[PDB]
């Protein structure tokens, strides 16, 4: 073997996390009792802590969680091998950037892929973000994503947000400053890793197709299972709550108050 | 320590 991070930049970012830790909010997560998903769209989950019921924004929590995991396992990440025997299933960066109508010319998409591609040795070494070129080295339109970092055992992120990941890696990351660049990449990985927003679908609407129904039901189930078996156990075991997250944790009920209305027969 | 990738 495991690589020791000699780097001054990673240590400054780890200290910055240490300085933002809210002790009381961290204790709430450390001793959480998971209740369930409230909203798969807005990404709200309900947890019990002692005598209270909390409404949590897990979009915000997974963001800091994956950011923290990224900071700890930096340069020692496992890989999610994204390639199969099916060459047609490959992930082409140029193809992903085509989702952005504002990148209205091949050159603007090529600009983004060029920066990412020039930094492929470090993206692979430090982040396990492996990019490969199938044709000639200068063919940006044939630049492919072969591996992603494996942040949490039992977790494989949805790749629906891959277009945003590449677009933000190419436009938001300050590649010029070591610390800002490194922080930026960890933030991009954390953003991609957050479970997707699942919009609400009306199961009573006869106007909506039969295949769209069982598909919403499957997405609804996949998240509930993810949160309950993978995410919340990890959150409960290692999550350090930053103070900026107090807005994302809301007390909704308390047992003393409930037990004044709900009573034994 | 600074990163070889940054010069």
């Amino acid at each position: 073997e495991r690589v020791n991070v000699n780097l001054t930049s990673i240590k400054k970012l780890r200290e910055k996390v240490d300085d933002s830790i809210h002790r009381e909010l961290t204790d709430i997560f450390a001793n959480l009792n998971y209740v369930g998903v409230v909203d798969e769209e807005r990404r709200l989950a309900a947890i019990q802590h002692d005598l209270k019921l909390f409404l949590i924004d897990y979009g915000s929590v997974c963001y800091e969680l994956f950011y923290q995991i990224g900071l700890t396992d930096f340069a020692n990440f496992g890989k999610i091998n994204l390639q199969s025997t099916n060459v047609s299933d490959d992930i082409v960066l140029y193809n992903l950037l085509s989702e952005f109508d504002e990148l209205n010319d091949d050159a603007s998409k090529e600009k983004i892929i060029s920066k990412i591609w020039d930094m492929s040795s470090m993206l692979n070494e430090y982040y396990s973000i492996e990019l490969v070129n199938d044709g000639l080295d200068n063919d940006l339109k044939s630049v492919k994503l072969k591996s992603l970092p494996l942040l949490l055992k039992g977790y494989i992120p949805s790749l629906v947000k891959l277009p945003f990941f590449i677009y933000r890696l190419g436009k938001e990351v300050d590649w010029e400053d070591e610390q800002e660049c490194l922080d930026g990449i960890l933030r991009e990985i954390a953003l991609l890793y957050i479970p997707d927003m699942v919009p609400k679908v009306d199961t009573s609407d006869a106007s909506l197709s039969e295949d769209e129904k069982a598909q919403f039901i499957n997405r609804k189930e996949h998240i509930s299972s993810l949160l309950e078996h993978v995410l919340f156990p990890c959150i409960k075991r290692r999550f350090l709550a930053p103070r900026h997250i107090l807005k994302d944790v809301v007390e909704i009920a308390n047992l003393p108050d409930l037990y004044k209305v709900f009573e034994r027969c | 320590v600074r990163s070889k990738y940054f010069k």
Partner: protein, 213 residues
């Protein structure tokens, strides 16, 4: 302090319809005694807290009140009765359900209800005669004399889901959805609340950085 209890039941009568229950979704179980549920109707989205015992009980109770034919003792010599009120008896088979088999001013009592834990008399027959009067309108087929009502309330309480019992989504869903079958099921037969509104989920601008460019 009881005004906070009243406004809760008042809110429910207006905010929750029979169909609203059928469209409710189970979030999970809270403190092994509560079912947390979401209800998104139109653009309105609310969380409710359901007592697993009291809600299961109100269902079992209402089932016993409607279906149960109470066991009667076939009388050795039939007993007559004078009323007025006489048209209430000569219109309802609610007496037969309460163990009162009759023979139609001129009333004839053929059977009286019986139990190994209580005695039944004419004061119970007159109590059922008065319980139909001042019901008021609504459903009269599920009306029971207090002695029988109390016994059904205990039957329901003993057979229903206990508090502290871990429940799975399937069971919790059945418990909540079952409430759509009852009229204003806000209380159990002992007067305890079955459910209450927790909070409305309108205007929560949750984390969205991952979809921002």
């Amino acid at each position: 302090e009881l005004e906070d209890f009243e406004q809760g039941e008042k809110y429910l009568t207006l905010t929750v319809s029979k169909n609203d229950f059928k469209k409710m979704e189970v979030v999970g179980q809270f403190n092994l005694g509560f079912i947390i549920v979401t209800r998104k109707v139109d653009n309105k989205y609310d969380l409710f807290i359901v007592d697993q015992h009291a809600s299961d009980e109100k269902y079992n109770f209402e089932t016993l009140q409607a279906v149960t034919v109470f066991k009667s003792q076939k009388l050795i010599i039939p007993q007559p009765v004078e009323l007025s009120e006489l048209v209430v008896l000569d219109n309802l088979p609610v007496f037969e359900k309460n163990g009162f088999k009759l023979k139609i001013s001129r009333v004839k009592l053929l059977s009286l209800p019986t139990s190994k834990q209580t005695l039944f008399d004419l004061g119970d027959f007159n109590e059922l005669i008065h319980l139909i009067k001042e019901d008021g309108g609504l459903r009269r087929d599920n009306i029971r004399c207090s002695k029988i009502r109390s016994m059904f309330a205990m039957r329901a309480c003993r057979s229903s889901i206990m508090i502290g019992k871990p429940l799975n989504k399937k069971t919790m869903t059945r418990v909540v959805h079952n409430l759509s079958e009852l009229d204003k099921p806000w209380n159990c037969p002992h007067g305890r609340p079955t459910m209450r509104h927790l909070m409305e989920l309108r205007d929560w601008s949750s984390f969205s950085k991952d979809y921002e460019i």
